[PDB]
Structures are given as structure tokens and as C-alpha cells.
Amino acid sequence: QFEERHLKFLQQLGKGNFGSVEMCRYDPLQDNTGEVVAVKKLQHSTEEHLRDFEREIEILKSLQHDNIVKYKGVCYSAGRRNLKLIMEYLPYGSLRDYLQKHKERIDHIKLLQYTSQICKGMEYLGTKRYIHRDLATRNILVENENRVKIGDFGLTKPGESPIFWYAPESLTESKFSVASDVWSFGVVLYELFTYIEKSKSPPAEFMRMIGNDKQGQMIVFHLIELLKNNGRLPRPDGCPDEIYMIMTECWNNNVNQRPSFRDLALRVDQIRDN
Numbered sequence: 001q002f003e004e005r006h007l008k009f010l011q012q013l014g015k016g017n018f019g020s021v022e023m024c025r026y027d028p029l030q031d032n033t034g035e036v037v038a039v040k041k042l043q044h045s046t047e048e049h050l051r052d053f054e055r056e057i058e059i060l061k062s063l064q065h066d067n068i069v070k071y072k073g074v075c076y077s078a079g080r081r082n083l084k085l086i087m088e089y090l091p092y093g094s095l096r097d098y099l100q101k102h103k104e105r106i107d108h109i110k111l112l113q114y115t116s117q118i119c120k121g122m123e124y125l126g127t128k129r130y131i132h133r134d135l136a137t138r139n140i141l142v143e144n145e146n147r148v149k150i151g152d153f154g155l156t157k158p159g160e161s162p163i164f165w166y167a168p169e170s171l172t173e174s175k176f177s178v179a180s181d182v183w184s185f186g187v188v189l190y191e192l193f194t195y196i197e198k199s200k201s202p203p204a205e206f207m208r209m210i211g212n213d214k215q216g217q218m219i220v221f222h223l224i225e226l227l228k229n230n231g232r233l234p235r236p237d238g239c240p241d242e243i244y245m246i247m248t249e250c251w252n253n254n255v256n257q258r259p260s261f262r263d264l265a266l267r268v269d270q271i272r273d274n
């Protein structure tokens with residue numbers, strides 16, 4: 001389906017210790033045309049990394065939704081001794097980058113449209129019995145001003161720490177569930193309403209709350225103790241009380257009391273419609 005000889009490099013997109021992503025053009029007709037795609041490569045095809053990459057491909061082959069990144073196929077390069085994953089190319093990259101780079105195009109109505117789409121993608125993911133774990137605007141991608149798609153770059157498998165999106169039971173017991181994805185969704189909703197303004201990010205805000213000078217495990221200790229006793233990210237400037245209430249309800253230490261993604265999509269769509 002994707003012959004390496006016809007997969008032409010266009011641009012580097014992202015790199016980490018685990019993998020890298022590039023933009024390519026798939027030109028089988030060899031006439032300088034063809035579809036543009038995003039291609040993920042494994043940096044080191046060890047038995048464990050390759051098993052993990054194959055599990056990712058299997059997950060992606062099972063997902064088809066408007067608000068989930070679109071799998072296209074695989075390419076077997078280096079004479080069929082290397083594996084690359086082919087996805088649809090999304091021009092605006094991560095929603096974290098888009099919010100910073102394209103503030104001219106964003107208002108609260110757009111933020112709520114993206115919020116709704118994220119909930120719907122998560123409703124779908126739950127029907128497939130997957131737990132995201134990594135929900136954060138860095139892992140949501142933007143097709144255009146009207147459409148976002150949940151993904152998981154998985155390139156890097158305090159400012160760079162994923163802990164600031166994790167539910168308290170995930171931090172203390174490594175318990176990840178649909179309900180902890182709801183907690184992380186509450187952090188995504190906070191990220192959207194802070195517009196990725198300098199110093200308002202979840203890592204910067206939590207570090208400010210615990211003490212900016214803390215390093216290593218002391219950060220973890222303080223974050224856990226803070227969350228267990230009702231410490232929370234503040235309401236972003238200009239955020240409506242009703243939107244901060246959705247964040248607060250997602251950030252419930254009582255796991256079963258968190259709303260569902262179906263509840264959240266309906267609530268957000270009703271606020272948009274009213």
C-alpha cells in the first residue's frame with residue numbers, strides 16, 4: 001500500500017527519544033503529485049519498542065472517528081526491515097501550538113467547539129475500551145479552525161512532565177481509567193481557557209503553587225498532597241464560572257462522582273446552543 005520508493009520527504013515535524021514524525025508526499029505516479037501524509041518512525045526497534053509500535057498500529061487500525069487522528073497504513077522500508085506508520089497530515093499541528101500561534105482566530109465559541117469535539121472523540125475511544133492516559137493539548141491536533149482530532153504523539157515515551165494532567169489515583173496507585181481521562185480532560189479544558197498564555201500552563205501554575213524552587217521527587221510529593229486536599233488550578237482570566245464549574249467537577253477526587261464524557265459533550269453542546 002505504501003512503497004518506500006514513492007514516499008518522499010517534505011519536512012521534519014517532531015522528534016523525541018522514542019520516535020520521530022515527518023511530512024511526506026506519497027507519489028506512486030512519479031509526477032511530483034500525490035497525497036501528503038505524516039509518517040512516524042521508531043528511533044530504536046528493540047523487541048519492546050517494536051512490540052509497543054505494533055500495539056499502537058493495531059489500536060489505530062481499530063479507530064475511525066471524525067475527532068480521532070486518521071490512520072492510513074504502514075510502510076516497510078530498509079528492504080522490509082523497518083516499519084513506519086502513515087497517518088493523515090493535519091496542517092495546524094498540536095492544539096497547544098495552534099492556541100499560541102493563532103490567537104487571532106480563537107474566541108470562546110471556538111474553544112467550546114473544540115471542547116465538544118474532544119469529548120466526542122473520547123466517547124468513541126471508550127466504546128473501543130481504550131484508556132487514553134495522555135490527554136493534553138500537546139496530543140490533540142488541529143485540521144482547521146473548525147476541527148480538532150485527538151491523538152498521542154508518543155515521541156517522548158518539570159515543564160515537560162506529564163504528571164500535571166494526572167488524576168490523584170493515577171499519581172498514587174498508577175490507576176488509569178476512563179475516569180482519570182475525565183480528570184485529564186478537565187486539565188485540557190483549563191489549557192484551552194488559558195490560551196497557552198506564558199506562565200498559565202498546568203506545569204507552571206502547579207509549580208508556582210507548590211514552590212517554584214522545588215526539584216525532583218519533592219515536586220511529586222507536594223503535587224499529590226496538594227491535590228488530595230483540594231488544591232486546584234485557578235479559574236483562568238475571563239473564563240466563565242460555568243466553564244470553571246465543568247473543570248472543577250472533572251477534578252473530583254471521588255472517582256465515581258466525575259461526569260462521563262457523554263454528560264460532558266451534552267453539557268458543552270447545550271452551553272454552545274444556548
Ligand SMILES: CC(=O)Nc1cc(Oc2ccc3c(c2)CCN3C(=O)Nc2ccc(CN3CCN(C)CC3)c(C(F)(F)F)c2)ncn1
Binds near residue numbers: 040
Ligand atoms: C503539522 C503537523 O505536525 N501535522 C501532523 C503531525 C502528526 O503527527 C502525528 C500525530 C499523532 C500520531 C502520529 C503522528 C503517529 C501515531 N499518532 C497517534 O496519534 N497515535 C495514537 C496512539 C494511541 C492512541 C490511543 N491510545 C490508547 C491507549 N493509551 C494507553 C494510549 C493512547 C491514539 C488516539 F488517541 F486514540 F488517537 C493515537 N500527524 C498529523 N499531522
